[PDB]
Every structure is written in C-alpha cells, then in structure tokens.
Amino acid sequence: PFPWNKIRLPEYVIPVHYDLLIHANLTTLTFWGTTKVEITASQPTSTIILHSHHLQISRATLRKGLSEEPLQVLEHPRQEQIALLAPEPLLVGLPYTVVIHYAGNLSETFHGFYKSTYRTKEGELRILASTQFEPTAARMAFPCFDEPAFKASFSIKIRREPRHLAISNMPLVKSVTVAEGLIEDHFDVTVKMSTYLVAFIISDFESVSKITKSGVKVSVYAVPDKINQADYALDAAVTLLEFYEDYFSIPYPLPKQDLAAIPDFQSGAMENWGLTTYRESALLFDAEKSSASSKLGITMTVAHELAHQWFGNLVTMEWWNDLWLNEGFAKFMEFVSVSVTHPELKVGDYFFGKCFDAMEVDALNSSHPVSTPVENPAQIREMFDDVSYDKGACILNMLREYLSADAFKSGIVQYLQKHSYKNTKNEDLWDSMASIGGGGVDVKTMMNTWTLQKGFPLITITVRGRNVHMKQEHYMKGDTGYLWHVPLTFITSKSDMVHRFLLKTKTDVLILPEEVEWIKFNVGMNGYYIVHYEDDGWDSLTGLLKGTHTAVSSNDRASLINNAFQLVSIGKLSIEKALDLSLYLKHETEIMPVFQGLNELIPMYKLMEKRDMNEVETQFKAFLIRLLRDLIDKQTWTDEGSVSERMLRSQLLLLACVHNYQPCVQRAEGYFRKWKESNGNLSLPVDVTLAVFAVGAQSTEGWDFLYSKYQFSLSSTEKSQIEFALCRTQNKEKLQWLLDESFKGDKIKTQEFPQILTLIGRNPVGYPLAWQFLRKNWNKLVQKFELGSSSIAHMVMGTTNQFSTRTRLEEVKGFFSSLKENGSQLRCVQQTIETIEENIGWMDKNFDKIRVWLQSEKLER
Numbered sequence: 001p002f003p004w005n006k007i008r009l010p011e012y013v014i015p016v017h018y019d020l021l022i023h024a025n026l027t028t029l030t031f032w033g034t035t036k037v038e039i040t041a042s043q044p045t046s047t048i049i050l051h052s053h054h055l056q057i058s059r060a061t062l063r064k065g066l067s068e069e070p071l072q073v074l075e076h077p078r079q080e081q082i083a084l085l086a087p088e089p090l091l092v093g094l095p096y097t098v099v100i101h102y103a104g105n106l107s108e109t110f111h112g113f114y115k116s117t118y119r120t121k122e123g124e125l126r127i128l129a130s131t132q133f134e135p136t137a138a139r140m141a142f143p144c145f146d147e148p149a150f151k152a153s154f155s156i157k158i159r160r161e162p163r164h165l166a167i168s169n170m171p172l173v174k175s176v177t178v179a180e181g182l183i184e185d186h187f188d189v190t191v192k193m194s195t196y197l198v199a200f201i202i203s204d205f206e207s208v209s210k211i212t213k214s215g216v217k218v219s220v221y222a223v224p225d226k227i228n229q230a231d232y233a234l235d236a237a238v239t240l241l242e243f244y245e246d247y248f249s250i251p252y253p254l255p256k257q258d259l260a261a262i263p264d265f266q267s268g269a270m271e272n273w274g275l276t277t278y279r280e281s282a283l284l285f286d287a288e289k290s291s292a293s294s295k296l297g298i299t300m301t302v303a304h305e306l307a308h309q310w311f312g313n314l315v316t317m318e319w320w321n322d323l324w325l326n327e328g329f330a331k332f333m334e335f336v337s338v339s340v341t342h343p344e345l346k347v348g349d350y351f352f353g354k355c356f357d358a359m360e361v362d363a364l365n366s367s368h369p370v371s372t373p374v375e376n377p378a379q380i381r382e383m384f385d386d387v388s389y390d391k392g393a394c395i396l397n398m399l400r401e402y403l404s405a406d407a408f409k410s411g412i413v414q415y416l417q418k419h420s421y422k423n424t425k426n427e428d429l430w431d432s433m434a435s436i437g438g439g440g441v442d443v444k445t446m447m448n449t450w451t452l453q454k455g456f457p458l459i460t461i462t463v464r465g466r467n468v469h470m471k472q473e474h475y476m477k478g479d480t481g482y483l484w485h486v487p488l489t490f491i492t493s494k495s496d497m498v499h500r501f502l503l504k505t506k507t508d509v510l511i512l513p514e515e516v517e518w519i520k521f522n523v524g525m526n527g528y529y530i531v532h533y534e535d536d537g538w539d540s541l542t543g544l545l546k547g548t549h550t551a552v553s554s555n556d557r558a559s560l561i562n563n564a565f566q567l568v569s570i571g572k573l574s575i576e577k578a579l580d581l582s583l584y585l586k587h588e589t590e591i592m593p594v595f596q597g598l599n600e601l602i603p604m605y606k607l608m609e610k611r612d613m614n615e616v617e618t619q620f621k622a623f624l625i626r627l628l629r630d631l632i633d634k635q636t637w638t639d640e641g642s643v644s645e646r647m648l649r650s651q652l653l654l655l656a657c658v659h660n661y662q663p664c665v666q667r668a669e670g671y672f673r674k675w676k677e678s679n680g681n682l683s684l685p686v687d688v689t690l691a692v693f694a695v696g697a698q699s700t701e702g703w704d705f706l707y708s709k710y711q712f713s714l715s716s717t718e719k720s721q722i723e724f725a726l727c728r729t730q731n732k733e734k735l736q737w738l739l740d741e742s743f744k745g746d747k748i749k750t751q752e753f754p755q756i757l758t759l760i761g762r763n764p765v766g767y768p769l770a771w772q773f774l775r776k777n778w779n780k781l782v783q784k785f786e787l788g789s790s791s792i793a794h795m796v797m798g799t800t801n802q803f804s805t806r807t808r809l810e811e812v813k814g815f816f817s818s819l820k821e822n823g824s825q826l827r828c829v830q831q832t833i834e835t836i837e838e839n840i841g842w843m844d845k846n847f848d849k850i851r852v853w854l855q856s857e858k859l860e861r
C-alpha cells in the first residue's frame, strides 16, 4: 500500500540543495548515481515522496543534521514516484539529508539522460551522452522533487574517462583522479533554479570562446569536425547576451554561458542555465552552403534561449499551466532583441506569420486558453504548442503596443527584479503591469480576457458616413458568449496617422470628423483578432489593393488577405470575392504579403490532390503560377539582395520549378547537370540550391546521386535541401526507403523523421505511405518521441490534416479511438479531427465554386 495517491508532490517536504554524483559509462551505456538532497519538513511526517523513473534504487539512508538511519523504499511506476519511509518521524524545522544510490542506462530516446552519436570524416562512429530534462525528465537521471516549484542549488560531480570532456551548468572547479583511470570533475554550485535546468554533457567537443563587455565567458561547443561553423553563433550570442543584460538592467548571474551543438536533439534548443543545447542545424552556420533562412533561424534561436535565461530561469512559472509565461515571453523577446541587435534582418517583416498560423488552430473548438490546467506529463508536453509560443507572443505584442513600449519595459523589469529566483503565477505579470499602467489602465481585466478563454475575436466594422460601428464576437470555425477587451487600431484614407479605441463591450461606435473612402483596422497586425468589413468595405479594399497596394503597409496587405480567407471559412465573405482580392498579387512584390498569399492558397490544392480533382487542381496550379509569373521571371538566380530578398527568391524559384515552369525547369536542369558532372564540387548559389535539387531529384539517377552526397555532406542546410529534394520524388519504393531509414536512424538520423514524414504526407503519391507508416509504427514512435510531444503532434497533423472526406474522417477517428490509453486523449488528435471536419465543410461549400471561378478567370485574358 503506497502512502501517496496524487500526481502532485507533497507540499510539506521542501528540498534546499542537491548534491549529484553521476558516473556515466559510454562503453557499456550505463551509469551509477548518488544523490544527496538536503530537505526540511514543515509538517511532522515519516514518509518522503519524490520522483524517480526507470531508475534502480539500491540503497537509501537518512542523516539527521551524526545519526544516520535506513529508509524503506516503496515504488509507484504509474505516478513515477518513490516513497522513503523513516523509522522516527521528522522534526519540524530541522534539516535532514536523504542519500540515495541508484543505477540505470542512457536513454535511447530524445529525453532524460540520453545517448547521441556522430560520424567522423573517416567513417568512424563516436558516442556522447547529453541531457534533456524539460519538462519531467530529470527524474530519469537523478531522483529529486521534479517540479518547477521546488527550486534548489545543485553541486554536480561527473565521472569520466580521461579521453572525455565534461561541461555542465557551472564552470569546472577541479578535477580529481578518483579510483584509477577515470577522472572526477567537481563543478561550482548553481543558483536557486528549477530542476529541469540541470544539464551535463560527456563528449570530446572542441570549443570557441569570447568575452562579453560584462565579463561573462561565452563559449560554443560542437563536434570536432564542425567547430568552424560556430563563429556567427558565438558572435550573435555575445551580442544578444549584452543586449539582454542592458535591456533588463539585470546582470547575467552565472560566470559562463555555453552553447553546445548536440547531434541528436528533439527540440530546437534548450535553456539549461549556463549550458544551452541546440540542434546542429539550429546553431551552426556555414557561409558556403547555409541559407539566409538558416542564418535568421540561428539568430532567432540564440535570442530565444538567451531570453529564457531571464524569462524561465531567473523567474520561473510555478506550475506548467502557466508555461506561456516562459515560452511566449521568450518567443516575443526574440523579436524585441533581434530587431535591435541585427537590424539588417528586419524580423518585423516575418514575425506575424506566427500570429496567423496560431489563429489557424486557435479558431478551433478544441483550442484551449493560454493558461489551462494540466497534471500528467503527457498534458505537460502538450502545453508546448502554438498557443503558448505564438499566441502568447502575439498577445504580448498587442499589450506592449497598447501600453507604451517604455511602460512594458518598466513593467517587465519590475517583474523580473521582484520575482527573481522564485516562481510566478499568471497574476504576478498583471500585477507588475498594473504597477506601471496608471493613466486609467487596468491591464488585469484585459489580459484576463485574453489569457483565460480560448479563441480570438472577429470585429465587424460598419460605416454610415462619419459613424464607425464596431462589434466583437468569438470567431469559431463551425455561439458561446465570450468577450474581450480588444485594443482596436485603425487608419483611414485621409490619414496615415493611427487612431485608437478600446472596445470593452459587445458593440460600440465612434464618430469620424469626415467621410472616408476606406478604413483599415488592426494596423500592422499588432492585434490578435481579425476584422470584417460590412457593405462594400471589402470591395473598397480590393480596389485599393488592385490600384495602389502601397497605400497600406506590407503587414496590412497580409492581414487583409488572411482575414478575407478566414472569413470565407465562416461565410462572412465569398470564396469568389476572396480570390478576386487575391488577383492583386500579380503586382505584389513584398515578402510578407506574397508568403501569406501562398500560405493561404496552397492548402486548397493540397486538399484537392487527396481527391479525384485533376482538372480543377491543374487549373488552380496554373492560375497560381500565372499570378506570380512576373515576379518569378524577374527573380534572378544568385545569392544577391538582403535576407528578405534572398528568402523570397529561394521560395519563388522552388515554387515555379515544382509546378513545372519550363524556364525554371530548364535552367535548374542545366545547373544540376553541371553540378552532378562536377561531382558536387561546383559551388551552387545557396538560394537556388533548393530548386536545383528539387528538379534534379525527379529522375532516379539524380535521386541516387543526391543521396550519395547526403551521407558525407556536413552542411545542415545542404542536408535539409537534399531531404526536401528526395521527398519530392514519385517513386513509392524510394519514399518507403526514406521513411524506413529515417525511422531506423542509421542512414538518416531519427531527429529528421517527423519533418520527412510530414513532407511525404505532402507528397501527392506518398500520403497513404505516410499515414500507414504512422499507424503501423505508432508504438515505437511514441516510445521514441514521448506522448503528447510536439513531435507526435507534428507527425499526426502532417499525416492527416490534409484529408477532406468523411471516409478519411472516420479512418482518423476510428484509429485514434482504438489507440485507447496510448494516445486517444491527445489534443492534437482532437485538433486533427476538427481540422478534417472544417476541411469537409469548406470543400463541400467552395470546391465547385472554385471550379466555376477558375473557368471565369480563364475567361479574362
């Protein structure tokens, strides 16, 4: 009979200091550990409950202070807990020391204390051991009070062979030759931090280091053959760390900051205090082969983790229900920091795709509020979704633009200083914001309306001369009674000046000083809502876009497109009028509106490919190509221009070459011929590399040649482009081979499996293979990627969310229901089901309409 029955830990036993000794054996893939945890008790008890998972406990003692007493061990695998029973009840106010000896073996997965391998340039395979403890994986490496609220200090000691190199959260204090033939590294003691931030790495990495203007030792570790790609990472890391220190007015508390490129990683990165971990693709930059997209991604990722150093590490959420207080703030500090440190990137151009893609799912009935209760690890992993990142950052952007940027900065500085080295709830942020908003600004109620209910509002705007009527309702892809405090912003045809109005009720009205030709709400996509215009409003905006699209901003044009199509999804606008608005892209030239038009148009022919709709689908693809043909023709085949122009060129050339624009196809075939005859030695323009590989991979010869180069390539961008090209094939046998080998993890590492599966589910001849593979290997995939993880969500959605028929809907429902306790309760499952339902509705309503509209559009030249 186990003396505990709740998933949460007892509140009356608090740890204060962990002392960890880990001996990891790379040859036998084992490790023995000793954990000494100093605790205090507030209620007299003889039972100590803590976390432990897949760890063999062999010995347990309890020291008082002199006196040491044995503890009896009880195990609960369902709750991932152990209970330690003490002969004499603990005395309140006294410090005790629990000492546990345990053993286990490096996880073969992507979490806990797991193994990674890398290939040398001589073909040899080398092994290292890394950590990934967020959210509840520290218990797989050391028994502890594995919750973010039980903060404590950590004194770490790691045992290794001499041939190895050990790094952790703190600097290395000393090395002692314990026993014979293996060294023991004693690291400095950490600060008050949560348990999920513990990390340690045993490898043979090389490193590059640099000093900040504040004296912190910033270093970047990687495998020996890839250390020469860490320069941009290190430089941007120093710049962003100095920026964050200066901005928050709070120095970095640790002596050193490390950025390690792990060969086997699940997430993009991890914010381990003093030892951030990354994907090699997400940290390393090769000037010869990496793309401008890759450079921007590295910059944004480094900014994200260095922001986590404050939002998450210094001030941590108390429970995983408010994980957005970490993740949304970090995703927003990405923008706030990079837009200052690397202004040549101009991240304000590409930020709001996050808000749009987040609305795509938050408009669903299965969506959840930004802050929602969770208990078990599957739910906690599910919390790392588009809401907590994208929607959190978008509502934070809206709040910072409603308040002054100066007021937002003062609020966040007060927040971090008041709650440093502690935990916060959702309400502490609103308290810190209301301590600054004193012009009649109740931040609390507004942000409660934005964080405590799901979805986002639709604002309908009616104009009767000089009167502007505004009505808010809950946008829901088919009546609840939700209400927001929407800080509306708008401009008129008579003024580029931004006028504001705070809509706190269902309907309201303001008075213009003069009649206007058009009015545009949600200026610059700084608000997390969508806008509909009554009467001839959409016609007026269509005329504006087709006449002088430069009358409004790039973000405004993108928001117009996205809002038009999302309103088609609920009937406030016809699909025909939406496409009439889309026709303006024939003269569009900016990256954000073009990319938004593509992101809103591609899913339609993606839905059509899954059905018998060849004529209408071909008409649609031809129309899409003819829409951008002028811009595609004007695009050059070089690496010229800014980062924005380079990414635009790459995507345009890839799109044209995929949809069979014969000039693009001919030139890409020529480049691929010259390259293949050069044996990969010819340097191709990184921007056109995607299109060249995608064209060359259509034939079996070029496909096999590309794969032959894949094994030995060392550029992560080159690897990703090769993956995309190989997934673009029509050979079912090769698709099956890619799937199986990326699953096995030998020829293609498993970290790339979810993206490869998603691309193959996009493939018009591969989607049954992807769906069937996910179904038939669900068990091992779940064991590898954890339940409810963003990887599982990505796989499920990439394999199913393009289905459009009731037969497919029943397939999905039946399979995920028969899964029972192994994934039937997945929020991603519910979201895919609702997405398929909305796809069915949208297809039954708009497909034949689109066919008629395409015939009408061909009858236009």
Ligand SMILES: *[C@@H]1O[C@H](CO)[C@@H](O[C@@H]2O[C@H](CO)[C@@H](O[C@@H]3O[C@H](CO)[C@@H](O)[C@H](O)[C@@H]3O)[C@H](O)[C@H]2NC(C)=O)[C@H](O)[C@H]1NC(C)=O
Residues within 6 Å of the ligand: 023, 024, 025, 026, 027, 028, 159, 160, 161, 180, 181, 182
């Ligand atoms: C992980 O486990 C492996 C295997 O149990 C350990 O390898 C063994 O390590 C010991 C001590 O280093 C070796 O003994 C010594 O080998 C050297 C080799 O020149 C010899 O000169 C010494 O007199 C002594 O025999 C042992 O040979 C070696 N076994 C083999 C064949 O690899 C490894 O050390 C463990 N790593 C740690 C520190 O956890």
Ligand SMILES: *[C@@H]1O[C@H](CO)[C@@H](O[C@@H]2O[C@H](CO)[C@@H](O[C@@H]3O[C@H](CO)[C@@H](O)[C@H](O)[C@@H]3O)[C@H](O)[C@H]2NC(C)=O)[C@H](O)[C@H]1NC(C)=O
Residues within 6 Å of the ligand: 055, 056, 103, 104, 105
């Ligand atoms: C990873 O480490 C664990 C230990 O933490 C290894 O567990 C060991 O597994 C073997 C094989 O199952 C166990 O032997 C078994 O004994 C049970 C009855 O006690 C018997 O029913 C089984 O048929 C088998 O003979 C062994 O007991 C267990 N560890 C301990 C200390 O009991 C595990 O094998 C390691 N990883 C892998 C992949 O093996």
Ligand SMILES: CC(C)C[C@H](CP(=O)(O)[C@@H](N)CCc1ccccc1)C(=O)N[C@@H](Cc1c[nH]c2ccccc12)C(N)=O
Residues within 6 Å of the ligand: 134, 135, 266, 267, 268, 269, 270, 271, 300, 301, 304, 305, 308, 327, 381, 384, 385, 389, 789, 790, 791
């Ligand atoms: C690029 C940048 C924003 C870094 C960031 C890493 P972190 O700093 O948000 C880390 N703390 C995630 C921790 C984690 C790991 C595994 C399961 C759940 C939670 C990221 O990759 N975001 C992606 C991908 C992602 C987040 N959680 C994941 C969990 C599994 C797989 C992928 C992900 C996103 N926008 O979600």
Ligand SMILES: *[C@@H]1O[C@H](CO)[C@@H](O)[C@H](O)[C@H]1NC(C)=O
Residues within 6 Å of the ligand: 365, 366
């Ligand atoms: C949304 O989904 C839930 C199931 O969790 C269902 O009970 C509810 O009825 C759905 N929406 C509506 C229209 O009520």
Ligand SMILES: [Zn+2]
Residues within 6 Å of the ligand: 304, 308, 326, 327, 330, 331
């Ligand atoms: Zn994060």
